[PDB]
Design an enzyme around this catalytic site. Structure first.
Site, PDB file in Angstrom:
ATOM      1  N   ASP A 148       0.849  -1.271  -0.073  1.00  0.00           N
ATOM      2  CA  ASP A 148       0.039  -0.041  -0.074  1.00  0.00           C
ATOM      3  C   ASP A 148       1.036   1.431   0.015  1.00  0.00           C
ATOM      4  O   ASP A 148       1.770   1.282   0.654  1.00  0.00           O
ATOM      5  CB  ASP A 148      -0.867  -0.155   1.398  1.00  0.00           C
ATOM      6  CG  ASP A 148      -1.845   1.152   1.150  1.00  0.00           C
ATOM      7  OD1 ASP A 148      -2.628   1.527   0.409  1.00  0.00           O
ATOM      8  OD2 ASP A 148      -1.844   1.845   2.462  1.00  0.00           O
ATOM      9  N   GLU A 173       1.409  -0.629  -4.876  1.00  0.00           N
ATOM     10  CA  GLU A 173       0.353   0.231  -4.983  1.00  0.00           C
ATOM     11  C   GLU A 173       1.018   1.457  -5.505  1.00  0.00           C
ATOM     12  O   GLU A 173       1.604   2.421  -4.508  1.00  0.00           O
ATOM     13  CB  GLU A 173      -0.264   0.522  -4.020  1.00  0.00           C
ATOM     14  CG  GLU A 173      -1.660   1.016  -4.558  1.00  0.00           C
ATOM     15  CD  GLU A 173      -2.193   2.231  -3.615  1.00  0.00           C
ATOM     16  OE1 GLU A 173      -1.793   2.530  -2.375  1.00  0.00           O
ATOM     17  OE2 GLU A 173      -2.886   3.046  -4.165  1.00  0.00           O
TER      18      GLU A 173
HETATM   19  O1  LIG Z   1      -4.758  -0.803  -4.784  1.00  0.00           O
HETATM   20  N1  LIG Z   1      -4.497  -1.788  -5.499  1.00  0.00           N
HETATM   21  O2  LIG Z   1      -4.527  -1.514  -6.570  1.00  0.00           O
END
Ligand SMILES: O=N[O-]
Ligand SMILES: *[C@@H]1O[C@H](CO)[C@@H](O)[C@H](O)[C@H]1NC(C)=O
Ligand SMILES: [Ca+2]
Length: 496
Positions: free
Chosen positions: A197, A233
């Site tokens: 993340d 991400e």
């Molecule tokens: O945030 N995942 O694509």
């Protein structure tokens, strides 16, 4: 870190957004495994801030308090129970690792956390980890506010607070070790990989250093030497100094340009049309297929909380959504992730949805369990897109045609296109305002196939439409622009 570590035959992962551990455990056993899903991307399993204003919003899970696997989805044992049970049936567990920051610097101190751990954003004390002021980027960040102010300054983007979130000093061995400590515990429990993340907000080098500390997957379930799957991400849509390629040395990266342009095309925005999809993939400025984790929408942008903006398709646009996913799931580019959401009282005013903060279904803050309707749909406001016939069947389609090249492309110069995956699969779309009736080369073996979109192959028969392929691979297709599902999908395993 590029390989998803799914067992041969599994080619997708579902994001069971906000699902409890017991519910996911059951889903692996009752649906995911028998339907051939590769793994599950779970919501942050670590203790987070309990926010009551608004009430229990979904984003309070990206506001860490400690690394205790103790959240609204369940405690540590339930998590173990889930990972084990899923693994025992060949379904992987990918953890959403929120490691760039802790909570909002303005969040009141106390025990308002999912496990009760005390914390103090003001004094930067997270004694449960533990973290102190020495572990944050206060001094390193050079912005006047202390938060990220300008995305054209790649340094500040990494060293300053993302919208106020306390930025961890990821260059410190101490912080790197506390995170690796968190991730290895998970690895040794049996997780097959991670979603890093806010990777754009982490230095590629700092992520690398943290991965050098990571174990190899649990050898009871994985081949010796199995590196955990890693998809960073990073929201790169161009026009910004930070590029997603900078994170290729650490693993895969989310290709946010994917669901953005796919939604633009499907929505036929700005003159775009499906016939353009012939060179789908890299030819569109996307990262290399082997480095892309693709998806139509994610928990963020399906709320307008992310990349893609307005063009992003979600379950709310159910008709175009199945079509969007159908194409993604049939196209070989990248490693596919199916979204699985919950219904929230969405309501627009002056263009924005004021209820986008609404957390998952719950009773007084207690997330509601997933109920399975007799027709396999979900209750309790869980959308369960992965259970929609057209999606679940396209999930199977991807496994069946896995390896086969992209060929036999057809397009009318507008929005009705079709292509095949080797001699194992064929899919036709019609997003035009008029009927599509044409005989196409399918590259498939002669015979009768079940259209897996409108129906299923059951008992040696099709419950929906049927396509007949001749000795020359030819087959006639007919889709009305007003058809419930304007696309047909047939593959080796739907053949009568
Ligand atoms: O945030 N995942 O694509
Ligand atoms: C296929 O369906 C027909 C009825 O439509 C039935 O007569 C036939 O026996 C079925 N085939 C098999 C193999 O069950
Ligand atoms: Ca940072």
């Amino acid at each position: 870190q590029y390989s998803p570590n799914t067992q041969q035959g599994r080619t997708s992962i579902v994001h069971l957004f906000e699902w409890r551990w017991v519910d996911i455990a059951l889903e692996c056993e009752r649906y995911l495994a028998p339907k051939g899903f590769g793994g599950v991307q779970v919501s942050p399993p670590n203790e987070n801030v309990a926010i009551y204003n608004p009430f229990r919003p979904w984003w309070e899970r990206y506001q860490p308090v400690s690394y205790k696997l103790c959240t609204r989805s369940g405690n540590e044992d339930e998590f173990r129970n889930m990972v084990t049970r899923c693994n025992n049936v060949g379904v992987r567990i990918y953890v959403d690792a929120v490691i760039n920051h802790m909570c909002g610097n303005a969040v009141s101190a106390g025990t308002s956390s999912t496990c009760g751990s005390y914390f103090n954003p003001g004094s930067r004390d997270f004694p449960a980890v533990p973290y102190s002021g020495w572990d944050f980027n206060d001094g390193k960040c050079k912005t006047g506010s202390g938060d990220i102010e300008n995305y054209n300054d790649a340094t500040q983007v990494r060293d300053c607070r993302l919208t106020g979130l306390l930025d961890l000093a990821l260059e410190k061995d101490y912080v790197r070790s506390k995170i690796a400590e968190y991730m290895n515990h998970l690895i040794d429990i049996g997780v097959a990989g991670f979603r890093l993340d806010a990777s754009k907000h982490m230095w590629p080098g700092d992520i690398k250093a943290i991965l050098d500390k990571l174990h190899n997957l649990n050898s009871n379930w994985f081949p010796a030497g199995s590196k955990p799957f890693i998809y960073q991400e990073v929201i790169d849509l161009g026009g910004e100094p930070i590029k997603s390629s900078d994170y290729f040395g650490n693993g895969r990266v989310t290709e946010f340009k994917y669901g953005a342009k796919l939604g633009t095309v499907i929505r036929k925005w700005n003159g775009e049309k499906m016939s353009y999809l012939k060179n789908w993939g890299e030819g569109w400025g996307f990262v290399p297929s082997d480095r892309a984790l693709v998806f139509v929408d994610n928990h963020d942008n399906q709320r307008g909380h992310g990349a893609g903006g307005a063009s992003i398709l979600t379950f709310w646009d159910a008709r175009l959504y199945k079509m969007a996913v159908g194409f993604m799931l049939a196209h070989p580019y990248g490693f596919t992730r199916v979204m699985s959401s919950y219904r929230w009282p969405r309501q627009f005013q002056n263009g924005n949805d004021v209820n986008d903060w609404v957390g998952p279904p719950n009773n007084n803050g207690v997330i509601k369990e997933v109920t399975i309707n007799p027709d396999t749909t979900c209750g309790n406001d869980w959308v369960c897109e992965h259970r929609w016939r057209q999606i679940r069947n396209m999930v199977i389609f991807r496994n069946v045609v896995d390896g086969q090249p992209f060929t036999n492309w057809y397009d009318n110069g507008s929005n009705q296109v079709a292509f095949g995956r080797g001699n194992r699969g064929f899919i036709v779309f019609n997003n035009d305002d008029w009927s599509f009736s044409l005989t196409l080369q399918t590259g498939l073996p002669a015979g009768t196939y079940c259209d897996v979109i409108s129906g299923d192959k059951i008992n040696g028969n099709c419950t929906g439409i049927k396509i007949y392929v001749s000795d020359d691979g030819k087959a006639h297709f007919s889709i009305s622009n007003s058809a419930e599902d304007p696309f047909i999908a047939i593959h080796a395993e739907s053949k009568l």
